[PDB]
Amino acid sequence: TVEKSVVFKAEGEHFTDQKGNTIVGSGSGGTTKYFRIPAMCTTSKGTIVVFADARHNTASDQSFIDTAAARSTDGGKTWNKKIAIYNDRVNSKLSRVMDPTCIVANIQGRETILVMVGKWNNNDKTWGAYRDKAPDTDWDLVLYKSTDDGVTFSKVETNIHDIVTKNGTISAMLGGVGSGLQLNDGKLVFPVQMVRTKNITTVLNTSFIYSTDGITWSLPSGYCEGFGSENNIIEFNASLVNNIRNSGLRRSFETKDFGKTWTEFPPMDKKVDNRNHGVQGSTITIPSGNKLVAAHSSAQNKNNDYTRSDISLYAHNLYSGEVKLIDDFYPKVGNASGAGYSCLSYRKNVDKETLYVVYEANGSIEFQDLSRHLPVIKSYN
């Protein structure tokens, strides 16, 4: 609703802890140093809720991180901000909650916002390095929910750790990053990424977790190839279709048997190139009359490195396989310390359709209203 605003400003925000004391970060004046990994969910009231890692001290992934949330009830013009999930505070250099994935769903009639983040405390290396234990003793994946339109969040006591432990071949699991979905039948679905135990040949795989009530979750029996593992799933005709990060060309598979087997999905497979290393990207579907169109955001990465420039919006014709660049919304080189991530959000409330994007911009998280592009996108089918 505003065309563009700063949600969280690098070296310009101050948060308080659970006791009311300010969190003294490494930015100027003791502010939070950097923000990364934005996830956005819009409610039926039109409220925009944005989550992101508040990396207080450094952009580094192995550092002190809390999950910040920002809410706007005026179309993205102003934001009310606070911490939604605090890390455990076991280790002041490394305790962290990170990489949010959110869902906005009607669960049994109650509109709920779910946010899932991974949690670590003493691990000093990247998650992929811990493959001995099933699962890693330092790891956890926590789920919080809001049933009051994003004002308050509370932990959900779930069976996720149990399901992972029962499987016996997973060291750690994380959400796909960005947003998950509620299927036409009502089930909640979070795309996930996992690190397998040392015995498995494939270090990483992609899959999903599903639930009808948000409390008991299940993992399907099969697995999809990992690639760069961050991914999103869309529902198209009784198939679930994912769109996965990959260095070079992005990948896309479909499951017609609810997670047991996956085959390449031609309309979206290898259609967008993010260049060296790959980047997370956001994929959602938009209805157009009786059909569907997929909208996707990711970086063009013109420098072919970690600067991940030119974060853009693409439309994918799910019928013909055609792809078109709709708009290069952040046609700038990003900060190599951490850049290029994004999250799209589409909603039609009553008769009002909005398409919004949140993305990484030099340590800050920016917002843009892309609704103007809706007719062009909607024509792609």
Question: What are the structure tokens assigned to 299, written together?
Answer: 């970086």
Asked if residue 110 belongs to a known ligand binding site, the reply is no
249, burial (CB in 10 Å: exposed 0-12, middle 13-18, buried 19+): middle
> Using CA atoms, how far apart are residues 147 and 42, in angstroms rounded to an integer?
13
Catalytic residue among 13, 360, 366, 369: 360
What are the Cα distances from residue 57, in Å, to 21, 53, 84, 288, 346? 17, 11, 18, 44, 33
Cβ–Cβ < 8 Å for 229, 193: yes
Three-state secondary structure string covering the chain? CCCEEEEECCCCCCCECCCCCECCCCEHHHECCEEEEEEEEECCCCCEEEEEEEECCCCCCCCCEEEEEEEECCCCCCCEEEEEECCCCCCCCCCEEEEEEEEEEEECCEEEEEEEEEEECCCCCCHHHCCCCCCCCCCEEEEEEECCCCCCCEEECCCHHHHHHHHCCEEEEEECCEECEECCCCCEEEEEEEEECCCCCCCEEEEEEEECCCCCCECCCCCEECCCCCEEEEECCCCEEEEECCCCECECEEECCCCCCCEECCCCCCCCECCCCCCCCEEEEEEECCEEEEEEEEECCCCCCCCCCCEEEEEECCCCCCEEEEEEEECCCCCCCCCCCEEEEEEEECCEEEEEEEEEECCEEEEEECHHHHHHHHCCC
- Measured at the CA of 263, the angle between CA 248 and CA 196, to 5 degrees, comes to 70
Cβ–Cβ < 8 Å for 359, 342: yes
Catalytic residue among 13, 53, 61, 99: 61
Enumerate residues 6+ apart whose C-beta is below 8 A from 254: 236, 239, 240, 241, 242, 262, 263, 264, 265
Give residue 275's identity as a one-letter amino acid code.
R
Where do we find the tokens 């900060």?
Answer: 335
Cβ–Cβ < 8 Å for 356, 372: no
What are the Cα distances from residue 153, in Å, to 114, 167, 176, 206, 278? 9, 29, 21, 27, 32
61 flagged as catalytic = yes
Cβ–Cβ < 8 Å for 172, 189: no
225 flagged as catalytic = no
Topology (CATH level 3) of domain 1-381: Neuraminidase (2.120.10)
Where do we find the tokens 């013109």?
Answer: 302
> Nearest CA to 86 among 158, 175, 20?
20
30, burial (CB in 10 Å: exposed 0-12, middle 13-18, buried 19+): middle
Handedness of CA 278, 97, 66, 75 (dihedral sign): positive
Q: Where are the domains of the chain?
A: 1-381
13 flagged as catalytic = no
Cβ–Cβ < 8 Å for 318, 271: no
Catalytic residue among 130, 210, 223, 341: 341
Cβ–Cβ < 8 Å for 174, 102: no
Cβ–Cβ < 8 Å for 262, 222: yes
> Nearest CA to 292 among 268, 272, 325?
268
Cis geometry, peptide bond prior to residue 135 (ω within 30 degrees of 0): yes
Asked if residue 251 belongs to a known ligand binding site, the reply is no
> Using CA atoms, how far apart are residues 27 and 33, in angstroms rounded to an integer?
4
Question: What are the structure tokens assigned to 114, written together?
Answer: 């779910």
Asked if residue 308 belongs to a known ligand binding site, the reply is yes
Residues comprising the chain, all counted: 381
Where do we find the tokens 């920016």?
Answer: 366
> Using CA atoms, how far apart are residues 243 and 250, in angstroms rounded to an integer?
7
> Using CA atoms, how far apart are residues 132 and 192, in angstroms rounded to an integer?
20
> Using CA atoms, how far apart are residues 316 and 153, in angstroms rounded to an integer?
35
